[PDB]
Design a protein around this ligand. Structure first.
Ligand SMILES: NC(=O)c1ccc[n+]([C@@H]2O[C@H](COP(=O)([O-])OP(=O)(O)OC[C@H]3O[C@@H](n4cnc5c(N)ncnc54)[C@H](OP(=O)(O)O)[C@@H]3O)[C@@H](O)[C@H]2O)c1
Ligand SMILES: *C(N)c1c[nH]c2nc(N)[nH]c(=O)c12
Ligand SMILES: *[C@@H](N)c1c[nH]c2nc(N)[nH]c(=O)c12
Lengths: 259, 261
């Protein structure tokens, strides 16, 4: 029951990126922001410690980290004595960086750092309140065909209706997604239908955001695009992939209502 | 095809099974409720467009049964591809089905996500007992850690800890919780109390069960005049449970989430 870095399992980003027909020179920059709600270990005297971990994995890393393996790796801390909070931080940076293949950022935060922090919603216009009929739940990226026919705009849209089925467990993925762009104005009905069409599609959170980014790019051809999704946790860990034309990281990391 | 609405997925567990092991009678030493938060509630409207909400449920501690958590999650997943005419219908079905499973009327609120904007993450009341310079090496459950724990002057105190952990009975993963203990009685030794709470760490529990054991152990070893034990656990499978048990109080004032929830 002791600390065991061998439990981490990398998954290469190249599998789905090749399925999206991306080259190794990526159309986006960004990162996967993870929240570790259940981080716990023993101090040097055996007294339990609890914290929330905030992790950022660069989107250029060769691998993402499979979430269940990440949970089991964290559970291996639970019965292990560490000298200090700094030692825990150091071990997390080392093991997560080795797994992902690029340096990962890790903040280990005491629970009192969250007291009185507010829940946030996303920015700009919510596209969800449309009186439309959904006839089927098949994924269809052609729902975006001709979706960006309007005048040149810069705007931020979001939806709370993103759902997909997790590839390896068949359990539901729940997310909110924010889309900021400069380009021909997007048809809201087409964008909503496209997102709803993920509902029974097998996905990982990271690849779903990459698919949304690359489908919007190809069908809607904005000049600038940022897609940031915030998913509910699975097994005590959540993932918030951020992909952008121009931005390396989001300027905010705050929890939403279902997270 | 996803399974659609299926109330037969709900699994009742009689509260009396474990209460028997606590040597309780049918006449309970406590009152209270189990407050559940349903972070993943989603269904389709009559046109097939997804709806999302957060549910809040209160189950009376006098109900014959509690509801097994995995079954509750699967029952809620059965809504995900089911069409409902209104939010009111969803709320009404949740009340009906969860009341039938528990054996007593339960309260349900189905809230739009916008109701949560600017809502706080909260801590618990009173003094945190966790920052102690003590050594622990034996994690096995021991209620006798509370022997002689309340010797002090008569006081009213509120104490809390974030260090509650146990192992989830059926599904066998760790349970993470914070627990608030309010009492009036001889002052409790904080080292004994913390060692006792940490002794749950490798013990198989339901959350509801662990709070009732904490309540009944503090009553028998410390004999306060009045006591409330309230724990807030992190979610499993999108739902969390927050059992409240008290000699004199009915329910907590709100259902605000804590940092890990
Ligand atoms: C990744 O994905 C993993 C799959 O979960 P698993 O290890 O639990 O195997 P599993 O039996 O296949 O779990 C499948 C689903 O059931 C949920 N679940 C399990 N026990 C539950 C309970 N007592 N109450 C409510 N829901 C419950 C899990 O929630 P969780 O997302 O909280 O695990 C998971 O979402 C996560 O644990 C994580 O490691
Ligand atoms: C399901 N959505 C799932 C299961 N394991 C996962 N790992 C990662 N990194 N992302 C996911 O979305 C995962
Ligand atoms: C594990 N802690 C577990 C598994 N099923 C559960 N059901 C309920 N009602 N409480 C629990 O703590 C449960």
């Amino acid at each position: 029951n002791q600390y065991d870095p061998s439990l981490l399992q990398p998954v290469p980003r190249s599998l789905n990126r090749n399925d999206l027909h991306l080259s190794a020179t990526l159309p986006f920059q960004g990162c996967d922001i993870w929240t570790l709600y259940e981080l716990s270990w023993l101090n040097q005297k055996g007294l339990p410690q609890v914290a929330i971990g905030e992790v950022s994995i660069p989107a250029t890393s060769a691998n993402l980290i499979e979430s269940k393996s990440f949970k089991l790796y964290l559970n291996s801390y639970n019965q292990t004595r560490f000298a200090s909070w700094d030692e825990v931080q150091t071990r997390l940076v080392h093991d997560l960086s080795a797994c992902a293949g690029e340096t990962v950022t890790v903040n280990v935060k005491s629970l009192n750092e969250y007291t009185a922090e507010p829940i946030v919603t996303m920015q700009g216009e919510c596209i969800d309140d449309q009186d439309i009929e959904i006839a089927n739940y098949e994924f269809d990226d052609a729902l975006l065909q001709g979706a960006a026919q309007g005048e040149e705009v810069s705007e931020v849209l979001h939806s709370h209706l993103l759902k997909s089925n997790c590839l390896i467990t068949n359990q539901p993925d729940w997310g909110s997604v924010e889309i900021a762009y400069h380009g021909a104005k997007m048809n809201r009905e087409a964008l909503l239908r496209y997102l709803v069409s993920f509902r029974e599609h097998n996905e990982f959170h990271e690849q779903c955001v990459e698919r949304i980014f690359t489908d919007i790019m190809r069908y809607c051809q904005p000049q600038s695009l940022t897609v940031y999704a915030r998913y509910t946790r699975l097994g005590g860990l959540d993932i918030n992939p951020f992909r952008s034309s121009h931005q390396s990281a989001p300027n905010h990391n705050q929890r939403m209502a279902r997270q």
